[PDB]
Ligand SMILES: *C(=O)[C@H](C[C@@H]1CCNC1=O)NC(=O)[C@H](CC(C)C)NC(=O)[C@@H](NC(=O)C(F)(F)F)C(C)(C)C
């Protein structure tokens with residue numbers, strides 16, 4: 090037992106991280122087969138970054154201007170193209186460590202692990218959620234761009250995020266591996282703000298189920314509620330509406346514990362209306378919304394990769 | 395910016411995990427050079443585990459009774475011995491993925507990453523602290539034993555923990571890689587309790603420094619205090635005493651922010667006496683003590699491996 094914020098093992102992703110330098114700017118790249126993927130602002134100088142015209146900047150660069158290194162070894166670039174906000178650097182060597190992989194665009198509320206890297210080398214791994222406002226609450230410094238977020242299923246790495254920037258409240262924004270941003274954000278240094286966030290209701294419920302599995306049961310009351318009535322209260326506290334789809338996804342946890350989803354909703358409704366009166370749930374004094382229902386099942390059933 | 399609970403990249407440790415089966419019991423092993431390290435209770439049946447005599451149980455086993463698998467590949471065992479609470483299985487093949495490594499016994503208050511595995515395969519990675527009562531707050535299920543905790547320095551993996559058991563409050567206990575338990579615990583299934591824990595004061599202070607680096611500054615007051623006076627208040631709230639050694643270790647963070655350690659202690663003293671009045675620090679409603687001063691510097695300065 091016990092319940093922790095767990096990241097995926099990072100080994101399969103570690104074997105794909107490279108360093109990309111163009112002129113004076115250096116960031117991380119993702120090396121899969123014979124293509125290196127990296128953020129397109131590697132071709133900017135500091136002054137370019139206020140309002141860059143990337144198509145123009147890139148037309149002035151050739152293959153040899155891109156210095157790609159895997160550890161010590163330099164990889165020779167033999168082609169390049171721009172896909173939305175990412176660079177695709179074709180190299181003369183296929184990465185022998187390339188895992189079975191896919192590129193996915195995740196949905197708000199879904200979690201992934203970030204492998205934070207600098208100069209092509211990994212610094213740490215941590216679990217993140219795509220927030221409803223299309224940011225993530227990460228930990229990123231200068232040079233971290235090109236770091237990627239991922240999920241693993243069996244042997245397959247689903248890449249879903251590549252890091253590009255940091256927004257005014259210390260939140261972070263990026264793209265899928267096709268270079269399309271999550272959210273209304275653009276890769277230029279002008280004033281940009283995240284929209285107001287909301288709490289991921291389905292994930293809070295999953296986490297309450299995780300607490301019951303671990304024997305933290307004080308918050309369960311004797312009531313039930315309708316889906317419509319619960320959502321009326323969730324609205325007032327800045328929680329996303331709960332859908333039948335969400336209810337269906339909580340099915341396995343509900344069946345395992347014998348607590349109907351709407352009974353759990355009744356208990357959550359009380360927590361929202363009454364607070365926690367100084368108590369904790371799974372060690373936390375606030376309700377946690379960065380565990381999906383799958384995350385809870387993976388961790389409480391020991392799914393391996 | 396941003397501050398997250400960060401684990402070390404797990405790739406170097408992933409390459410060493412194997413599955414060890416003896417009779418009907420299966421758990422994880424650590425394969426370094428031509429030796430597999432695993433918990434000694436792999437040789438017990440369920441009934442043995444109430445009060446096992448391991449020296450007796452092991453005298454009745456030979457090399458071939460140990461089935462060691464690295465992925466699909468079975469490794470042939472050519473020797474075996476018991477060192478305290480661990481088994482040392484000599485195999486006829488040296489692990490080609492063996493990283494540069496050391497075996498360390500960490501101190502209470504120090505952090506490490508756990509790579510949780512089942513059947514020799516990794517399930518997740520998370521950061522842990524050795525508590526003052528010599529437990530860790532982990533997430534472990536049946537079959538997780540043999541999972542290891544580690545730190546990385548440059549290229550060197552310092553292994554410091556191997557998992558053995560779970561104590562009544564959902565806390566976990568284990569050994570160093572020499573088979574010696576952290577704490578007064580024994581690997582047998584009889585009633586055992588952790589002693590009362592305490593809060594790691596030096597780590598809370600490090601985390602408050604991390605908050606200032608990230609611009610969360612509301613809790614800084616205008617006061618200072620003596621080391622003796624602070625520790626008088628820490629005692630009453632179940633915090634470890636702060637030593638000059640701890641003060642010296644907070645030096646880099648103090649110098650970086652320009653806040654003397656004893657000024658920080660004054661602010662911590664107020665938090666303890668007054669609470670947080672509904673506010674959060676770095677997103678947390680409770681004070682966090684599982685970040686060492688090094689952890690804060692690594693993450694805020696982007697140390698890579
Ligand atoms: C790439 O390594 C960095 C990662 C940043 C640095 C601080 N923490 C991070 O997550 N990305 C940038 O420096 C990025 C380059 C642009 C060309 C996209 N710029 C920013 O993140 C800036 N943000 C903005 O201007 C804002 F988000 F629009 F507000 C700052 C001001 C440098 C953070």
Ligand SMILES: *C(=O)[C@H](C[C@@H]1CCNC1=O)NC(=O)[C@H](CC(C)C)NC(=O)[C@@H](NC(=O)C(F)(F)F)C(C)(C)C
Pocket residue numbers: 090421435438443534535536537538539540557558559560561562566580581582583584585586
């Ligand atoms: C090895 O895979 C497991 C890991 C356990 C299982 C539940 N979560 C874990 O961390 N270790 C054991 O099953 C262990 C075997 C003994 C021979 C050491 N036994 C225990 O952890 C038991 N604990 C105790 O009897 C106690 F800690 F002394 F109280 C339980 C009751 C199975 C947890």
